[PDB]
Design a binder for this molecule. Sequence first.
Ligand SMILES: [K+]
Ligand SMILES: [K+]
Ligand SMILES: [Mg+2]
Ligand SMILES: [Mg+2]
Ligand SMILES: [Mg+2]
Ligand SMILES: [Mg+2]
Ligand SMILES: [Mg+2]
Ligand SMILES: [Mg+2]
Ligand SMILES: [Mg+2]
Ligand SMILES: [Mg+2]
Ligand SMILES: [Mg+2]
Ligand SMILES: [Mg+2]
Lengths: 135, 177, 51, 78, 116
Amino acid sequence: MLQPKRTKFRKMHKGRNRGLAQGTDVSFGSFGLKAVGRGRLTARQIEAARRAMTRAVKRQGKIWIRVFPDKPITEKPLAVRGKGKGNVEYWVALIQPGKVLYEMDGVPEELAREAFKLAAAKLPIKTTFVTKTVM
Amino acid sequence: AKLHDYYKDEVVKKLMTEFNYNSVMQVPRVEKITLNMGVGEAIADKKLLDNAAADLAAISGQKPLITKARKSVAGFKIRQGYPIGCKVTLRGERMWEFFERLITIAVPRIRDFRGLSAKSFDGRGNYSMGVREQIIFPEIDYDKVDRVRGLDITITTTAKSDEEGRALLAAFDFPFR
Amino acid sequence: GIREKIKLVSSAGTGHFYTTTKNKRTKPEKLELKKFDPVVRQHVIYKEAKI
Amino acid sequence: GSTRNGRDSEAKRLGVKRFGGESVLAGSIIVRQRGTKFHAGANVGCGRDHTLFAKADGKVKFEVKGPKNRKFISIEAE
Amino acid sequence: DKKSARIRRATRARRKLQELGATRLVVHRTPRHIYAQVIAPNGSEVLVAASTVEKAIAEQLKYTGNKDAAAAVGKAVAERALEKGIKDVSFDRSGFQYHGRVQALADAAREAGLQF
RNA sequence: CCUAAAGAGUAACGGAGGAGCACGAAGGUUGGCUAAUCCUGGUCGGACAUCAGGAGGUUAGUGCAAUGGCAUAAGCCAGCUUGACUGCGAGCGUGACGGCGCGAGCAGGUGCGAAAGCAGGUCAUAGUGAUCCGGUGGUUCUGAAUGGAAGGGCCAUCGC
RNA sequence: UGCCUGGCGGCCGUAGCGCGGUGGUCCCACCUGACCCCAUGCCGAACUCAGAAGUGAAACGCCGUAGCGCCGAUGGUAGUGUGGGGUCUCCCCAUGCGAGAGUAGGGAACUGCCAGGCA
Ligand SMILES: [K+]
Ligand SMILES: [K+]
Ligand SMILES: [Mg+2]
Ligand SMILES: [Mg+2]
Ligand SMILES: [Mg+2]
Ligand SMILES: [Mg+2]
Ligand SMILES: [Mg+2]
Ligand SMILES: [Mg+2]
Ligand SMILES: [Mg+2]
Ligand SMILES: [Mg+2]
Ligand SMILES: [Mg+2]
Ligand SMILES: [Mg+2]
């Protein structure tokens, strides 16, 4: 599960998630899965979608994960009432509309579409299949 | 004195033709000769460096500068501001007078001598060498020394490349192999 | 809290004094400074004494 | 559980007290600052805590001088 | 480099004199010559000057870059300054040690009647 | 320091760290000086000691957190020193108040500098505690009939 | 008057590095000595003094060259004050303000005082 090796700080303000994404182009591969919705992707979701995607292409071609879960999310234990910020439980990437989540190369488009369809079913955010443009 | 007049009245003309220089100032000059006794065993007993300084004083004929530690190092067990060596810089007359005693007298007297290396150059035409014993020089005696100590010599030159550096030293008949 | 308070007493015999602190372990020798004595209105030697 | 945080210091009310074009009497503090974010120009002094103060009556003027593009404050005698 | 290292040495004092708003006596010194200038507070206006490059002064001298030449230039610049009527100036050694030729120039300018 | 919404201020058992000192030099001044790191060569010497040159340009340093500063250096070295002065202070900042802070300049006397000048501690911001009672020294004040003295005041300073 | 050189300011990278060429009568630099004035926590390297045989090599200055650093539109986009609206964790509309990045493009500086040499 993706996670920063180290961080300056353990805990982060909730913050907000406004705006449109940077990294909206297929930069590395030929085909991309792009976020159309807004939300958070946990490390577990990123991994689950990766596994489905990889299996679907039978470990042929190459897959880039463009998103990294670098935001720590805390939670308070059950039956606790205050008394300080909770403990870090998991990590997320903030997603905005347009963010390319995954790229893939060295497979037919037909297979890429299938793999990304399987991946998209693991994600809480609405996605769309995209292709590399010349400009 | 001897090598200084030897440089001006002979060596100049040789290098003017060899490398085909236009101006006389473009010819390499021996800027300075720097000594070094990296005494790193004087952290326990400081008298070792004092005696080493006295030895270096006789060799050069000039008061040695006690070099200090630049930064603290745990590996060698040294703190910043500890005396761990002594250098001497030679320019003008004392430069040549030492350079005289080096080439002719001292270098042959090295124990099991088989010529000095000609690969010891940095890139900007500045030679370096490692003297193993200090007793090779005439000033120091074999019986008088308590402990044998080596030292380093570096010959700084107004050179650009290595070929120009070795060519300058070769004009003074510097033992090469 | 190692530095002890001391008084520097005027040598002019005015009874005027300054106070300061001093690390008595590191520097056992007595502090001695020319300072302005306002009673005689002159720079005179001031010498350390017990607070 | 408990927290190991919960500490802060009093706010020190730093910053610019008199902006550009303001008329100040000599002595007037122009800026309170930690270190010289602004430097003293003409008719301005720098205190021991790097407070910039007017050494003459006049109008405050901010200006950028030098290669580093340092901010100077000066008093235009008026 | 030597000149840049000297400009560094001169900055503190020059910035200070600018702040005080003093009429400077700026000295410049080379191996062969020594110059002198009385520059106005604003800093972009030379009032008087003197040097060993000037033939009026140079003709009287044995060598231009020695103590004795500096003494002459010091006398020269001071007389021309008192002619215009300046008197009060601040000496600016311009990064050179106040010593030897620079000191010689300065001493001669004082003796002549400049107030510093 | 962040939360703090580009003036100030701004809460929570919000997120992170520090203090309860040090220094007669680590203060003053004059003169000078400029870092880290890596590459190349070199006795013992090694990944790293000291020497030389080059690149680099402050990525160092700053007595101790962090932030803001610092080359005219506020960083580093040396000489001479006691301005870590006394009486004051236009004006200003910041506090409900008690208070806390910055300060040109004036008088006296000083140090450094040829001089212009600079110096009323320290790159700055923590290192602390009111009042009462009491102690010590000083004093052109007071002194219960009067002269003294005790005691009180005032100035300096100390204690738990 | 013009050219070149020095000094002191005004102007802060369109003014900086690099690359190519170029200057020594004066000026400047290196350079020549050092017993001295003065100087090295060693060293006449630097500082300093006494000099003018040599040299424009290095440094410094001047001219060319987009190769970099750097500068930089227009348009669009982001954000946003006020008013209004929605499917309200986020947006949209009216109106005003309008970046950053990037793109075209540029860039190889400009200017006063004094002095000196030369024509
Ligand atoms: K000091
Ligand atoms: K000192
Ligand atoms: Mg926000
Ligand atoms: Mg704060
Ligand atoms: Mg604020
Ligand atoms: Mg605000
Ligand atoms: Mg409120
Ligand atoms: Mg200090
Ligand atoms: Mg009585
Ligand atoms: Mg009675
Ligand atoms: Mg626009
Ligand atoms: Mg723009």
